[PDB]
Amino acid sequence: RLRPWLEEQIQSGRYPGVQWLDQSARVFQIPWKNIDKDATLFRNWAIHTGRYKPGIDKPDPKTWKANFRCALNSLTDVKELQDAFRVYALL
Template sequence: MFSIPWKHAARHGWQVDKDACLFKQWAIHTGKYKEGETQPDPKTWKANFRCAMNSLPDIEEVKDKS
């Protein structure tokens, strides 16, 4: 089991380099983002990552109820 930090961008203190680094790296890995060539779009990176995780049959979301 693993945990992915999923902080909402509207929250106080949200920083793209800290709170969206996994999503950015996924966008770079998939070729959807090229640093210096395309505009940063953390909202789309996060949505694309979520869709990729949801499409994998061996990944199951376990919601934290604490």
Template sequence: MRPWLEAQIDSSQIPGLKWVDKEERIFQVPWLHGAHQNWDMEKDAPLFMRWAIHTGKYHPGEERPNPRMWKTNFRCALNSLSDIVEVKDKCIRRDQTPLEFIKCCL
């Protein structure tokens, strides 16, 4: 997962997914709750959808989108990596939009 995720961060194609401190390997994952009134699959789930496609758990055009499952699978994959930890003291909420800062120790 790590090389794939770093490529996604470096691509700058997913809004909100970015390096906070590349030297320290700290990155930010936009994490808007699906029940939020402004939640939009196209805007708020592309990282999770890309992960589902990458892992073969979603085939666009062949099955219904399931962003809740994509997000769950992404979080489980992150949690399974012992050297990636959430930097809890840096998690913030701006305008009701949660941003998770996760440190990747390579």
């Protein structure tokens, strides 16, 4: 379920740093950066997967980021391009 969701998130542009680097190639970029106030991809992914209920349980970005890294790293159809940001290609 992560690949369909992630595609629209890059598209929304409502996540600073989360943008296409080569839209033709579906190559995009995630800002990989215990308090984070911002509405990051990790937070909204925890919201969407039902694992964070804003305002009623206490924010926790360490776990948001950890759990997003598990989902994204286990996608077979998303590959990381490697040599504070990660570059991925949709496939």
